[PDB]
């Protein structure tokens, strides 16, 4: 079982094709090592893929005549409290066709229960006035509320200078999944319910980069966190081995490169590669394809200035004078530096760079610098031929997973 | 709350905590399951107001109860409703259902003057269990079994690419190729949404998984069905074959039936709740028998007259006296 | 299926203005293609030539944009456009409009400057409309419990490609074909001259008034039919 | 189907990001892989296994190192050499000579930091020079070489004025920017501002840089998951987005310490984006070996980033997708629920509440005029929406108490109306009739507030319709792109009780259904009032007022 | 520092706009929307050009905890697809004109 | 603040397939008018100023709700991209990678031409016809966009642009758009231009295929 959260890796000697073409099981024709690149798995917190993307730095943790006092509003209404008696359940929920007021008529037609607002918004609540017989008073009516999600009833109180008046409201608090198009937010009355939103008138560590990749077998990108608990720095050592009216060469800008009309591109190409020349060259620019960089500088007056058209000479914009380029940038690649440790390669626990330098902890070379190297911790597992590797390549394994 | 965190827990806490759970929660849960009483529609309607249930301290002390060979028990009183629709008048009375035995702090009941304890039983937890099976010649057939609170045995075995048997009993050997719709489910609308469908090319006894089963069925099959739902779903049956196929390819591991995570411990709380349910099951028959006699004689009985203490008291006395788990205190 | 109605004036009526050879393609080529495409697309459909105006509304399909809609709208737009111009042109509205534009756009001088700016600002190929607003939405709470006279007013609506205020239940009164084909051929790209000459030499207020006296007749029954 | 061991390997490289990275094994680990191949306990016959066995003794390692002539550290360095076939060497061919114009950055001046607008417009005239057409044929003509090509022969005035402004800005913000780096960036990382003793005077700030200019620099750090970082003489190192297994071949060419010619692709805010200088190699050309691309540049998540929508809006990332409601916004009914009416309703109740008490008993009210009336004590500590819990004789229900200050009440207008409406009922009593009043002056002002809100919903809706066709006829999206993604995008397991997959209605609803158990009570409760009654007739409540009025 | 919500949500703000602008816009002909202290959640399905005459309105985009303070006499153009709320603390009235694509 | 970039050819070099007089107004009036209007808008705002051409269009596009400056900003790029997409003695048939990519994605050039012409013909009203490279899909595509819309708003990289605005052909072809489209693909389209646009696009899409090691 894996002893740490991480992602599967094998350099070679593992069958890329699974054992059966529906399973994440691979066989080893030859014995090899299976590496688990350590990485924090923040699978216990919600990940918003619109803001959480690859290599994002995470400085914060993830989340996790009393009629005229009534009112017919959107999927809710208020009624005065004590002939329209009110019936409510023990906790109070009017599922469907439930009665909330009967209004026993002694004569055996309906008295208005609302101030007849001038705008009838399309509410889900439907009010019906079923008249019952009770025999077979007898024609005591009823008030039936229906919709097409649950209603809740809870009386509200209007306090003013001590005197008190009771007011029962019947909302339509839904599953909040239908509260799209914020206009349709009965939360407009939700604050008077059990809400505590600030009106902004009287209200007055964790680190780690995102290591997120898309495993298409899941149709959902999986997440790993690379932090100081997974990636460590190996101590400094010397592993990089290097092979006129002008100022000293300094790394810096040369200036904006204007587009060349002979190449009709808004941003100049300035360079082809081996593939590009034999794929993109219009049989007319061959005369211009140079193996050596030729630098031309022009002024606002349109004059073309080059200084010596035989050596790599460019202008420093900040100091406003010419200086030489470093190595003439020949077309053929030549080795300038040579690092002992290459990028991306693994090593075991007791590999020695030299006599003086201490041993290198197991892991993968993640960052290569001039002197020091940063390693992502990895745990190699030896596997004999005939063993069955559980999981595809770069699959996330949690602690205790086979 | 931090009972056993620091000190040694009380040896009788399991007995103590179970009984309090039964009194606090195991009573209304069973009482809420008591249905309405009516034949078709007449001048009769009987029901129990669960929220009004009360328990009265026993008159006799523990020493008196053992000396008199009585049963130290509390009296259960629930308000009951009766209406005679010919009169259309509501008659209300606080009826006496019966006696609920009470245990002392030491964890012992006394029934008919003898100290009796209710030992704990360990049972297989409700859920899905993938276990291999061998036959007279050897098949190594992976078998998925579904267990309910009733000890359901809905076995679901895979004979490779052939049919998937779903024998409820040993004689009920039946496939699921045509049981796609089965109970109330549908044809190949979701069957082809996972893996491949080329293979396809009772009401209440064992049909609900309960609170425990829903957690376990979601725990193994990774289902999004909320734990509030109790009844089994065809999605669960569909997902049963989904993980079953993975075992053939080597993904996953067979369940170990001896693992305690697959076992459930039922204490005196569970057993006393079950006997209460049986008492109410026998109680609804008594009132149904009573209303038939009352109608046949045409008398106006009070709600107390429709019930008797026999269904509640007798079942517990039968439980403590006959159930193997209810042993005499040593 | 509908026949192409020739403009109600001779083809050589405005030579000191937009020339005939422009009209030989604006009407003889552009409009002919629009109507004939409908004849090739409404051969055996459910409508098969019920009424030209409702075809645009029906083919609108509440924004679904059925393929026959574009030719249908263009056929009505250009046909409506031809009626908007008479050989006389220019002038000022006579009474019926005057009671409206003065109370809706301040004054005729303010309106004409506003109308020219709207047409000029119309990017790409499209149409600019001066349409009476008698909207009646087919949705809940659409009806005003207290209708007001000034609620139904005149609005300057600029519409791209081929869409007419008929799809808003509006009643267009006049329009200017701001499509480049209407004006690019004669006076190069000077749309400003096209808009100016259209307003000061081509507008038919009497035709607009006739199409306005019908506007508060479709509107004159909606409030009383119910 | 299946997959041979040539396309699954290709699939792993392309999709799984596989790469046969070198494993620098210890002699003990190397012996394990060379000896377990032959079996479990067998005489080692393969010469590789035999040699690996002899290497288990580091003393034997010394002999081989000594015999082959190595200082025992090259051997420790030889084991780290890349194994396998080398990639074909790069031959970067220039697309003609590069012509460079000293163009000041367009974004100058930075946010805020007002400068001489007259000077700024003089600088910005150089930007129009980009449209000048330059041909390679007319390049040697009037070319200047040597003394005539010196700086003193150059105008560069618009760029010189920018340098004057740039230098002034640098002095006034050198310390300010450095303090912000410490305040926000805890640890220095490639791409962050160079601070502390590592900072040297003369380093170019970000406003000096602009996309499209050519820079010469050296790669300082190589990151496997991020790319190579080039020092271009600025405070922030440039970044080349090389990601994933593409480094398997690029590492042969792009190695730390080499000098490169690089092109600035984009410049971003260092506070939000962690790599403010997005670069692109032009020598050597790596564009034919970069297959893994960053869809969006990596960003920070600073201390205050509570709203996810703000974060994605600061950068260019799409909004958070939501399940599409499936309802057309234009066909939804208009809204007339003006929010202030609910608050205004509370004021209306208070006006009638005080008046009813005042009219009921001529209390101490006569001492002070209604308009003159002041508020009571302790109104400050009333939380004004403060919640609560109450309980009736049969029902337990939540309670909300709403305080209302007497300041926001028109008592004088209300009492006159109260008296005026009071002087309108005795006429009904003079004829023995009721006097149900249509509406109160508070009610009618709610009508206009709803009318104003309804008017807002109306003219928006018709404007929405006109917006629909214009976008429909032009292809513009009706709703926000990215938001409201189609169904089934949010995973594969969605609890749908409506669907028969999650339906539990096999043979009727079971008696233990919580919905059915919570349905029989409503059957009991609604029939606890009516019993075995029969419905004579049934119609909606809106019709229940019409016929009574028509009476 | 985090960017201000104004340009973050590309909400055009024209504070203390001169009287010249109000003429050609026909602000005198814009509909009036008046309210007191209340909260108005809303999502702009179409571009809205709001001119404020008195009071002040604080708008918080949905999911945010920062408010945008608009005083009287300003011009606010809420873009499409903006989910926010309209908070108020004083009697507030506005003149507004919803604008479609390329309307004006 | 962008100068009016002249086409890489004299205005009379497109004869007889394109009259120079129509060039004098299409480039001299429409394009210059777009140039002047955009420069005035950029003078007002210092945020839109400083955006690169590709970034300015995408920012002004505002994810489907274009700013008032978008129409001017989008058009100046489209017209600039249009002149370079054409050349005297153009038309003919593309070769090398452009031909290979068209054959790889559209099956054949004749299939591409039919797809290109049908998109151009079905484009109702003012608009542009774009041969573009998809970043995510890594293939060529033909997209019709009305008015000033260009595929930069979707990060797609244009390769060949055709202007079907009525101002671009009415003075020469009037209602005969198809003939105008055909002569564009036969003697006007600069397939040499597409290769250079491909070369820059190749720096961001990598239309190639990797070299997976055997080990
Ligand atoms: Fe036209
Ligand atoms: Fe054009």
Does the beta carbon of F198 lie under 8 angstroms from any beta carbon of chain A? yes
Q: DSSP letter string over A217-285?
A: TTTS-EEEEE-TTTEEEEPP---B------B----EEEEEEPPPGGGT-SS----B-HHHHTTS--SSG
Query: Residue F195 — left, alpha, or beta (φ > 0 → left; ψ -120 to 50 → alpha)?
Result: alpha
Token digits of residue D67:
């015999």
Instruction: Spell out which residues of chain D touch residue F215, defining contact as CB-CB under 8 Å.
Output: 20, 84
Q: Is D201 exposed, middle or buried (0-12, 13-18, 19+ CB in 10 A)?
A: exposed
CB E47 within 8 A of CB F65: yes
Q: Residue holding tokens 């496939």?
A: B175
Cis peptide bond upstream of C88, omega within 30: no
Beta bridge partners of E99: E47
Q: What are phi and psi of D118, to 5 degrees?
A: -60, -45
Contact: C167, D470; criterion CB under 8 Å? no
Instruction: Spell out which residues of chain F touch residue A12, defining contact as CB-CB under 8 Å.
Output: 215
Contact: F65, E7; criterion CB under 8 Å? no
Contact: D466, E34; criterion CB under 8 Å? no
Residue F169 alpha carbon to ligand 2 centre in Å = 10
A121: closest chain C residue by CA: C141
Q: Of D320, D271, D263, which Cα lies nearest the Cα of D299?
A: D271
Residue C124 alpha carbon to ligand 1 centre in Å = 12
Question: What is the 3-state composition of chain A as percent helix, strand, coil, each rounded to the nearest 5?
Answer: 5, 30, 65
Q: How many angstroms is the resolution?
A: 3.0
Chain center to CA of E53 = 11
Alpha-carbon gap: E21 to the closest alpha carbon of chain D (Å): 22
Instruction: Spell out which residues of chain F touch residue C184, defining contact as CB-CB under 8 Å.
Output: 166-167, 170-171
| CA–CA dist A283, A169 (Å, integer) | 82
Interrupted after residues, chain A (C–N over 2.5 Å): 64, 82, 108, 136, 148, 204, 243
DSSP letter at D506 equals B
Strand ranges for chain F from DSSP E: 127-133, 140-146, 157-163
What SS3 state is found at C162?
coil
Contact: D510, B208; criterion CB under 8 Å? yes
Contact: A182, E41; criterion CB under 8 Å? yes
| CA–CA dist D247, D242 (Å, integer) | 7
Neighbouring chains of B at 3+ CB pairs within 8 Å?
Answer: A, D
Instruction: Spell out which residues of chain F touch residue A264, defining contact as CB-CB under 8 Å.
Output: 8, 84, 190, 192-193, 196-197
Give contacts of E 37-66 with F, CB under 8 A: 47
DSSP letter at D486 equals P
H or E stretch including D353?
helix D339-360
**Chain D interface test: which of C65, C139, C148, C158 (most D C-beta within 10 Å):** C139
| CA–CA dist A307, A313 (Å, integer) | 7
Instruction: Spell out which residues of chain C touch residue D454, defining contact as CB-CB under 8 Å.
Output: 141
- DSSP H helices, chain B, are 13-21, 27-32, 62-67, 210-221, 234-249, 268-297, 310-322
Give contacts of F 48-87 with A, CB under 8 A: 53, 80-81, 84
Give contacts of A 197-236 with E, CB under 8 A: 199-201
DSSP letter at C189 equals T
Token digits of residue A2:
């894996």
DSSP letter at F184 equals I
**Chain F interface test: which of A265, A268, A278 (most F C-beta within 10 Å):** A265
Q: DSSP letter string over D65-126?
A: HHHTT--SSHHHHHTTSPPSPPPPPPB-BEESPEEEE-PPPTT-S-SS----HHHHHHHHGG
Neighbouring chains of D at 3+ CB pairs within 8 Å?
Answer: A, B, C, E, F
DSSP letter at C203 equals B
Token digits of residue A328:
């003439």
Residue C30 alpha carbon to ligand 2 centre in Å = 20
According to the entry, how was the structure determined? cryo-EM
| CA–CA dist C79, A277 (Å, integer) | 57
Q: Is D432 exposed, middle or buried (0-12, 13-18, 19+ CB in 10 A)?
A: exposed
If one counts every other C-beta atom within 10 angstroms of the C-beta of residue D118, the result is 7
Helix crossing, B268-297 with B13-21: angle to 10°? 30
Contact: B184, D517; criterion CB under 8 Å? no
Alpha-carbon gap: C10 to the closest alpha carbon of chain E (Å): 36
Query: Residue A283 — left, alpha, or beta (φ > 0 → left; ψ -120 to 50 → alpha)?
Result: left
**Chain B interface test: which of D393, D395, D506 (most B C-beta within 10 Å):** D506
Alpha-carbon gap: E25 to the closest alpha carbon of chain C (Å): 10
Does the beta carbon of D503 lie under 8 angstroms from any beta carbon of chain C? no
Q: Rg of chain B over CA atoms, in angstroms?
A: 25
Among E1, E38, E103, beta carbon nearest to D339: E38
Alpha-carbon gap: A384 to the closest alpha carbon of chain E (Å): 54
CB D262 within 8 A of CB D215: yes
Query: Residue F59 — left, alpha, or beta (φ > 0 → left; ψ -120 to 50 → alpha)?
Result: alpha
Q: Is B260 exposed, middle or buried (0-12, 13-18, 19+ CB in 10 A)?
A: exposed
Strand ranges for B109-190 from DSSP E: 109-111, 114-118, 121-124, 128-133, 141-146, 154-158, 164-165
Q: Which residues of D467-492 are buried (b: 16+ CB within 10 A; e: fewer)?
A: bbbbbbbbebbbebbbbbbeeeeeee
- DSSP H helices, E9-56, are 19-24
Could you tell me which residues of chain F have a Cβ less than 8 Å from any Cβ in chain C? Answer: 25, 29-30, 71, 124-127, 146-148, 165-167, 170-171, 174-175
Helix crossing, F109-122 with F96-106: angle to 10°? 70
Contact: C121, E104; criterion CB under 8 Å? yes
If one counts every other C-beta atom within 10 angstroms of the C-beta of residue D19, the result is 21
CB B277 within 8 A of CB B100: no
A241: closest chain D residue by CA: D257
* Residue B171 exposure: Cα atoms within 13 Å on the Cβ side: 0
- Whether B and C touch, i.e. at least 3 CB pairs below 8 A, reads as no
Residue C81 alpha carbon to ligand 1 centre in Å = 9
């Amino acid at each position: 079982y894996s002893d740490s959260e991480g992602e599967m890796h094998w350099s070679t000697d593992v069958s890329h094709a699974p054992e059966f073409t529906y399973s994440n099981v691979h066989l080893l024709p030859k014995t090899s090592h299976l590496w688990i690149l350590s990485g924090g798995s923040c699978g216990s917190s919600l990940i918003l893929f619109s803001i959480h993307k690859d290599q994002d730095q995470m400085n914060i943790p993830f989340l996790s005549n009393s009629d005229l006092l009534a009112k017919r509003r959107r999927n809710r209404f208020l009624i005065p409290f004590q002939g329209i008696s009110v019936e409510i359940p023990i906790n109070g929920i009017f599922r469907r066709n439930s009665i909330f007021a009967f209004f026993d008529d002694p004569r055996y037609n309906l008295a208005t229960l609302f101030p007849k607002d001038l705008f009838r918004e399309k509410d889900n609540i439907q009010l019906r006035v079923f008249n019952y017989i009770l025999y077979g008073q007898l024609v005591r009516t009823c008030l039936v509320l229906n919709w097409d999600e649950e209603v809740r009833a809870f009386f509200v109180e209007v306090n003013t200078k001590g005197l008190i008046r009771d007011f029962i409201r019947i909302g339509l608090v839904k599953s909040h999944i239908s509260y799209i198009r914020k206009r349709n937010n009965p939360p407009d009355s939700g604050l008077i319910s059990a809400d505590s939103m600030n009106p902004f008138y009287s209200i007055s560590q964790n680190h780690g980069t995102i290591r997120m990749f898309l495993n298409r077998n899941k149709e959902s990108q999986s997440l790993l966190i690379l932090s100081s608990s997974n990636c460590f720095r190996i101590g400094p050592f010397n592993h990089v081995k290097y092979h006129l009216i002008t100022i000293k060469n300094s790394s810096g800008p040369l200036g904006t490169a204007i587009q060349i009309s002979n190449f009709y591109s808004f941003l100049p190409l300035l360079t082809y590669n081996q593939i590009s020349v034999i794929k993109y060259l219009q049989l007319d620019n061959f005369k211009y394809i140079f193996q050596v960089i030729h630098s031309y500088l022009i002024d606002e007056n349109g004059r073309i200035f080059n200084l010596d058209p035989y050596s790599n000479l460019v202008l420093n914009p900040f100091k406003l004078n010419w200086y030489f380029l470093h190595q003439n940038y020949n077309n053929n690649y030549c080795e300038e530096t040579s690092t002992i440790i290459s990028l991306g390669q693994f090593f075991c626990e007791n590999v020695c760079i030299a006599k003086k330098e201490p041993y290198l902890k197991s892991g993968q070379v993640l960052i290569v610098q001039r002197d020091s190297v940063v390693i992502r911790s990895a745990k190699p597992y030896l596997a004999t031929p005939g063993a069955k590797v559980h999981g595809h390549y770069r699959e996330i394994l949690y602690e205790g997973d086979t | 709350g931090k009972e056993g965190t620091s000190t040694i827990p009380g040896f009788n806490q399991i007995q103590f905590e179970g009984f309090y759970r039964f009194i606090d929660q195991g009573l209304i849960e069973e009482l809420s399951k008591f249905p309405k009483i009516e034949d078709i529609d007449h001048e009769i309607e009987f029901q129990l107001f669960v929220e009004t249930y009360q328990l009265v301290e026993p008159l006799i002390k523990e020493r008196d109860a053992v000396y008199e060979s009585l049963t130290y028990s509390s009296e259960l009183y629930v308000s009951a409703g009766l209406i005679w629709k010919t009169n259309r008048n509501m008659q209300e009375q606080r009826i006496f259902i019966g006696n609920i035995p009470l245990m002392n702090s030491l964890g012992t009941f006394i029934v008919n003057g003898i100290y009796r304890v209710v030992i704990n039983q360990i049972l297989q937890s409700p859920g899905i269990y993938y276990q291999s099976e061998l036959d007279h010649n050897g098949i190594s057939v992976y078998t998925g079994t579904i267990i309910s609170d009733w000890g359901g045995r809905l076995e679901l075995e895979i004979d490779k690419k052939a049919r998937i048997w779903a024998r409820v009993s040993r004689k009920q050997k039946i496939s699921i190729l045509v049981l796609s719709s089965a109970m109330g489910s549908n044809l190949r609308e979701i069957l082809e949404n996972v893996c491949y469908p080329e293979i396809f090319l009772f009401f209440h006894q064992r049909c609900e998984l309960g609170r425990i089963g829903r957690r376990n069925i979601n725990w193994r099959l990774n289902l999004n069905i909320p734990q509030n739902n109790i009844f089994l779903l065809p999605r669960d049956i569909l997902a049963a074959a989904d993980h079953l196929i993975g075992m053939k390819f080597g993904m996953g591991t067979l369940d170990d039936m001896n693992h305690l995570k697959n076992k459930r411990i039922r204490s005196v709380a569970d057993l006393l709740q079950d006997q209460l349910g049986l008492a109410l099951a026998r109680l609804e028959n008594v009132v149904k028998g009573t209303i038939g006699g009352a109608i046949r004689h045409k008398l106006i009985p009070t709600p107390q007259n429709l019930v008797t203490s026999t269904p509640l008291t007798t079942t517990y006395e039968s439980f403590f006296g006959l159930h193997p788990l209810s042993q005499v205190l040593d | 299926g509908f026949e192409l109605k020739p403009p109600p004036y001779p083809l050589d009526a405005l030579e000191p203005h937009m020339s005939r050879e422009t009209l030989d393609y604006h009407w003889g080529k552009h409009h002919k293609t629009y109507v004939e495409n409908l004849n090739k697309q409404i051969v055996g459909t459910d409508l098969d030539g019920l009424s030209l105006e409702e075809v645009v509304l029906l083919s609108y399909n509440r924004g679904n944009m059925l393929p026959a809609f574009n030719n249908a709208a263009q056929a009505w737009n250009h046909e409506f456009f031809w009626e908007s111009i008479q050989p006389g042109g220019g002038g000022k509205p006579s009474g019926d409009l005057l009671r409206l534009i003065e109370r809706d756009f301040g004054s005729f001088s303010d309106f004409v400057e506003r109308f020219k700016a709207a047409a000029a600002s119309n990017f790409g190929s499209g149409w600019t409309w001066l349409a009476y607003k008698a909207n009646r939405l087919d949705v809940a709470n659409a009806v005003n419990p207290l209708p007001k006279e000034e609620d139904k007013k005149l609005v300057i609506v600029k519409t791209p490609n081929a869409v007419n205020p008929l799809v808003w239940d509006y009643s267009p009164l006049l329009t200017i074909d701001t499509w480049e084909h209407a004006y690019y051929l004669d006076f190069e790209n000077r749309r400003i001259e096209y808009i100016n000459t259209f307003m000061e030499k081509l507008v038919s207020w009497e035709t607009v008034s006739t199409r306005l006296e019908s506007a508060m007749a479709r509107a004159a029954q909606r409030e009383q039919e119910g | 189907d299946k997959d041979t061991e040539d396309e699954a390997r290709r699939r792993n490289w392309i999709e799984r990001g596989w790469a046969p990275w070198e494993e620098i094994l210890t002699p003990e680990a190397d012996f394990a892989r060379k000896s377990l191949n032959e079996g479990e306990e067998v005489p080692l016959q393969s010469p590789e296994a035999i040699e690996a066995f002899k290497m288990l003794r580091p003393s034997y390692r010394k002999k081989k190192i000594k015999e082959m002539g190595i200082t025992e550290d090259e051997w420790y360095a030889k084991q780290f050499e890349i194994r396998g076939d080398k990639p074909p060497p790069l031959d970067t061919s220039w697309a003609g000579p590069l012509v460079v114009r000293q163009i000041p950055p367009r974004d100058w001046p930075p946010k805020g930091w007002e400068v001489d607008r007259k000077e700024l417009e003089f600088i910005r005239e150089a930007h129009k020079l980009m449209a000048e057409r330059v041909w390679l044929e007319d390049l040697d003509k009037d070319l200047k070489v040597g003394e005539d090509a010196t700086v003193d022969k150059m105008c560069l005035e618009r760029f010189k004025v920018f340098l004057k402004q740039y230098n002034e800005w640098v002095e006034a913000n050198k310390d300010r920017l450095e303090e912000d780096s410490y305040k926000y960036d805890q640890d220095f990382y490639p791409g962050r501002r160079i601070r502390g003793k590592d900072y040297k005077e003369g380093m170019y700030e970000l406003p000096f840089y602009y996309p499209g200019m050519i820079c010469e620099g050296t790669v300082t750090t190589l990151h496997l998951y991020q790319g190579a970082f080039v020092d271009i003489g600025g405070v922030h190192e440039g970044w080349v987005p090389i990601k994933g297994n593409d480094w398997f071949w690029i590492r042969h060419f792009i190695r730390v310490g080499m000098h490169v010619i690089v092109e600035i692709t984009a410049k971003r805010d260092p506070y939000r984006f962690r790599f403010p200088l997005e670069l692109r190699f032009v020598h050597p050309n790596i564009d034919h070996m970069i297959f893994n691309k960053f869809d969006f540049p990596p960003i920070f998540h600073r201390d205050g980033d509570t709203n996810p929508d703000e974060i994605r809006r600061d950068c260019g990332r799409p909004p958070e997708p939501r399940k599409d409601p499936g309802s057309k916004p234009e066909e939804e009914g208009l809204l007339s629920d003006h929010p202030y009416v609910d608050k205004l309703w509370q004021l209306h109740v208070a006006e009638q509440m005080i008046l009813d008490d005042y009219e009921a008993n001529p209390e101490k009210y006569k001492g002070k005029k209604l308009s003159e009336l002041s508020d009571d004590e302790g109104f400050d500590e009333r939380k004004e929406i403060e919640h609560g819990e109450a309980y009736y004789k049969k029902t337990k229900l939540p309670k909300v108490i709403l305080k209302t200050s007497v300041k926001e009440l028109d008592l004088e207008a209300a009492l006159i109306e109260r008296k005026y409406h009071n002087k309108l009922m005795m006429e009904a009593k003079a004829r023995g009739e009721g006097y149900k009043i249509e509406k109160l002056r508070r009610n009618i002002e709610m009508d206009e507030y709803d009318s104003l809100h309804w008017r807002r919903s109306l003219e928006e809706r018709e404007a929405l319709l006109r917006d629909i066709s214009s976008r429909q006829a032009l292809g513009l999206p009706l709703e926000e792109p990215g938001r409201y993604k189609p169904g089934s995008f949010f995973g594969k397991d969605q609890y749908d009780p409506t669907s028969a997959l999650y339906q539990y209605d096999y043979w009727g609803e079971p008696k233990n259904s919580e919905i059915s158990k919570q349905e029989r009570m409503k059957d009991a409760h609604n029939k606890s009032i009516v019993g075995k009654g029969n419905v004579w007739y049934d119609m909606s409540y809106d019709d229940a007022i019409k016929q009574t009025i028509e009476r | 520092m985090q960017t201000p919500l104004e340009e973050l949500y590309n909400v055009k703000v024209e504070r203390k706009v001169s009287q010249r602008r109000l003429d050609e816009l026909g602000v005198s002909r814009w509909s009036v929307w008046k309210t007191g202290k209340c909260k108005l959640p809303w999502d702009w399905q179409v571009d809205q050009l709001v001119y404020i005459e008195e009071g002040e309105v604080r708008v918080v985009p949905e999911g945010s905890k920062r408010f945008m303070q608009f005083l009287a006499g300003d011009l606010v153009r809420y873009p499409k697809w903006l989910e926010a709320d309209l908070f108020f603390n004083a009697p507030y009235s506005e003149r507004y004109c919803f604008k479609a694509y390329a309307d004006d | 603040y962008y100068g009016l970039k002249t086409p890489p050819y004299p205005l009379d070099a497109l004869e007889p397939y394109m009259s120079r007089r129509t060039l004098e107004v299409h480039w001299g009036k429409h394009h210059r008018g777009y140039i002047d209007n955009l420069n005035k808008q950029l003078g007002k705002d210092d945020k839109l100023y400083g955006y690169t051409m590709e970034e300015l269009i995408k920012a002004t596009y505002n994810n489907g709700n274009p700013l008032p400056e978008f129409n001017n900003a989008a058009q100046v790029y489209n017209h600039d991209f249009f002149w370079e997409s054409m050349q005297p003695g153009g038309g003919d048939m593309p070769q090398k990678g452009v031909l290979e990519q068209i054959e790889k994605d559209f099956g054949s050039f004749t299939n591409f031409r039919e797809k290109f012409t049908n998109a151009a013909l079905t484009q109702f009203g003012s608009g542009w016809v774009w041969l573009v490279l998809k970043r995510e899909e890594r293939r060529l595509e033909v997209v019709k966009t009305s008015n000033a819309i260009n595929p930069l708003v979707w990060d797609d990289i244009p390769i060949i642009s055709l202007d079907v605005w009525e101002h671009s052909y009415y003075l020469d072809y009037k209602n005969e758009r198809g003939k105008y489209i055909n002569t564009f693909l036969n003697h006007l389209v600069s397939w040499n231009a597409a290769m250079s646009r491909m070369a820059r696009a190749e720096a961001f899409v990598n239309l190639g295929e990797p070299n997976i090691p055997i080990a």
